[PDB]
Ligand binder design. Structure first.
Ligand SMILES: CCc1ncccc1Oc1cc(Sc2ccccn2)cnc1NC(=O)NC
Ligand SMILES: OC[C@H]1O[C@H](O)[C@H](O)[C@@H](O)[C@@H]1O
Length: 448
């Protein structure tokens, strides 16, 4: 109950969530309007993915994905189906990216990428061929078009000098060129949210929102072109990359932030940025729990006031431990084993307290996340005429998919916040690969 008072600080009431939801809708509006687009914490970035186009090229496409801890290269075949195109991943390969290839420059990084592409082509009797390439790039970008836009800044702990302010597609063409090895026709760069959204569209035409809850957290949704003041035109809809991860960066979340959030922020690669994401994303969630455990140790409430060397080092409480702790069946075997590995020797009640600390943090992530999505859905609701708006949300990310209860709490809370909306949630199958490819296919019809 001394424990419970500390953890209860993570609670959010219905009214707290409604306040976060209204504030998110307010920032989405400010991000879309010319007069406020520039100071907006929520950037609402036009993506040039549109509802208007007809016709799609068929054939084989290469898809890149950068923005996990792993970089992925795959081949995907697009062909002609019913009411649209099918797509399927045929060939694929994952690569890690080393320290010195990320402490360095952008040039170096994109060379590594180019080196990985060649490797994949070598290995697949492909080196000689030239194909349209789709680039899923999970970072905030200001687009000039479907095949051009600049990196605004790194998120999720990516460093690389000389990337911010530059055309990311340019940076990759410059690296393909500086290798001579192979020719590739970069036809489309998209965000992961957008890739996920697009990949759910084939099976569900109602899918107009894409969401990621993984290392980071973000969404995109189809906006009416008249509301997209940053792109001339009123015809049809364009996908907007909200970048809601940066919500709170102008102080909108100050009343809700905890000591643990301020500590995570100050110690991150990006002080004062991505504050909403720092409440939710798997890059931060284990670290939040860690900090909570340290506070309980210092109050002599956990591990008899003794923390191991491992518990005291940043990043040691991994986000996957939070999910494992919450998967524990009640026998405390999972919890004991995780803590033992961290050099602790926990009692029965220690294990239970650790469980509670995980649920408070993950439950707060789910609820916060729900308020942002509810804001996106209720904003869309305002432009729609039906009695009940039926909308499909495409989702990916290990926090959403793999955390035992996150998805259930998130669904219930979102639904509470969105009256007269019927919401269908679809988890993408190779959303990133296929989505990049499907957008490339359509862009090729005219672009290539
Ligand atoms: C959800 C936004 C949307 N609604 C309605 C139509 C299109 C549409 O956008 C696309 C869908 C697809 S996949 C697709 C397209 C049609 C049928 C089945 N599958 C690929 N690119 C784009 N857009 C582009 O602008 N491509 C560059
Ligand atoms: O990968 C999930 C998200 O992580 C961060 O929020 C990135 O800025 C965003 O672009 C991405 O979509």
């Amino acid at each position: 109950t001394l424990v419970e008072q500390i953890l209860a600080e993570f609670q959010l009431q219905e009214e707290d969530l409604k306040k976060v939801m209204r504030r998110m809708q307010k920032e989405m509006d400010r991000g879309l309007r010319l007069e406020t687009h520039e100071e907006a914490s929520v950037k609402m970035l036009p993506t040039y993915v549109r509802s208007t186009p007809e016709g799609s090229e068929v054939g084989d496409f290469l898809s890149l994905d950068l923005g996990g801890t792993n970089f992925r290269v795959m081949l995907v075949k697009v062909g002609e189906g019913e009411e649209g195109q099918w797509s399927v991943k045929t060939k694929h390969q994952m690569y890690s990216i080393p320290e010195d290839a990320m402490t360095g420059t952008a040039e170096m990084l994109f060379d590594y990428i180019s080196e990985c592409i060649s490797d994949f082509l070598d290995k697949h009797q492909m080196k000689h061929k030239k194909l349209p390439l789709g680039f899923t790039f999970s970072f905030p970008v200001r687009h000039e078009d479907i095949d051009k836009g600049i990196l605004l800044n790194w998120t999720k702990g990516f460093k690389a000098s000389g990337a911010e302010g530059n055309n990311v597609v340019g940076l990759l063409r410059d690296a393909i060129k500086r290798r001579g090895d192979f020719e590739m026709d970069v036809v489309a760069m998209v965000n992961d949210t957008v890739a996920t959204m697009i990949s759910c569209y084939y099976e569900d035409h109602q899918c107009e929102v894409g969401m990621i809850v993984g290392t980071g957290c973000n969404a995109c949704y189809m906006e009416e072109m008249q509301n997209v003041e940053l792109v001339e035109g009123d015809e049809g809809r364009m996908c907007v990359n909200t970048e809601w991860g940066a919500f709170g960066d102008s102080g909108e979340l100050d009343e809700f932030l905890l000591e643990y959030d301020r500590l995570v922020d100050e110690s991150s690669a990006n002080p004062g940025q991505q504050l909403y994401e720092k409440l939710i994303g798997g890059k931060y969630m284990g670290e939040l729990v860690r900090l909570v455990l340290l506070r309980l140790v210092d109050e002599n409430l956990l591990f008899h006031g003794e923390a191991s060397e491992q518990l005291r080092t940043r990043g040691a409480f991994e986000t996957r431990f939070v999910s494992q702790v919450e998967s524990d069946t009640g026998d405390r075997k999972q919890i004991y084993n995780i803590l033992s590995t961290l050099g602790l020797r926990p009692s029965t009640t220690d294990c239970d307290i650790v469980r509670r600390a995980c649920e408070s943090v993950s439950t707060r992530a789910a609820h916060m996340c729900s308020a942002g999505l509810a804001g996106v859905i209720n904003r869309m609701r305002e432009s729609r005429s039906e009695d009940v708006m039926r909308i499909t949300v495409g989702v990916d990310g290990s926090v959403y998919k793999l955390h035992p209860s996150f998805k259930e709490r998130f669904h219930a809370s979102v639904r509470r916040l969105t009256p007269s909306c019927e919401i269908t949630f679809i988890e993408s199958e190779e959303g990133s690969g296929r989505g990049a490819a499907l957008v490339s296919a359509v862009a090729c019809k005219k672009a290539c």
